[PDB]
Amino acid sequence: SYDSPDYTDESCTFKISLRNFRSILSWELKNHSIVPTHYTLLYTIMSKPEDLKVVKNCANTTRSFCDLTDEWRSTHEAYVTVLEGFSGNTTLFSCSHNFWLAIDMSFEPPEFEIVGFTNHINVMVKFPSIVEEELQFDLSLVIEEQSEGIVKKHKPEIKGNMSGNFTYIIDKLIPNTNYCVSVYLEHSDEQAVIKSPLKCTLLPPGQESEFS
């Protein structure tokens, strides 16, 4: 019992996710009274809010999460999006949001593993096969190493590392080092931490017996 009534009839909350450096934005329009099925994902760029587009296949669509790999190439812009959802045949809502990709860039879907050796770590971040030489990105990757209780944030040069089986090795460690390795990117702040579900790969723990 606090604040105003729980307006659970239009959460109008949208989220964007970057799968293999592909943009995909979704929406969260809660249902209370009317039951809207089809929606229309409309998007634009903050610098030009007058250039909104009802993306094909994302207009009156009885689906929710709409994709956009080459539709939001303005990585250096805040893709302002207006998702207008009509309940059945009538317009029931029209909400917008300034998507800060350049500042948010949510990366997670990509594949990633980490094999740990008795005395070292073998981290492999599986980013899509792409030739950065034609990449409009300007983001890095952060290999966070949480071994045996020790948390760390690695940020290897992604100048050609975000194009397949990223290869990083966390060394300078002693046997028995179970580390949860996350794969979050960094643009220029400590708030863009898309720390995906880590990977806790251990090494042959050298905590065996003890003799001469």
Tally of CA atoms within 13 A in the half-sphere of 112 that contains its CB = 30
- As annotated, the residues of the chain forming the CATH 2.60.40.10 domain(s) are 1-106, 107-212
Q: What is the dihedral of CA 18, 79, 188, 193, to 10 degrees?
A: -40
Q: Which CATH class is domain 107-212?
A: mainly beta
Question: What distance in Å separates the CA atoms of residue 43 and residue 45, rounded to the nearest whole number?
Answer: 7
What is the CATH number assigned to the segment(s) 1-106? Answer: 2.60.40.10
Contact 105, 194 (CB under 8 A): yes
CA angle 105, 107, 112 (to 5 degrees): 155
- What is the experimental method? NMR
Contact 116, 122 (CB under 8 A): yes
Check the CA dihedral 131-181-66-24 and report its sign: negative
What the block records as the tokens of 41 is 């994902």
What letter does residue 137 receive in the DSSP assignment? -
What is the identity of the amino acid at 69?
Answer: T
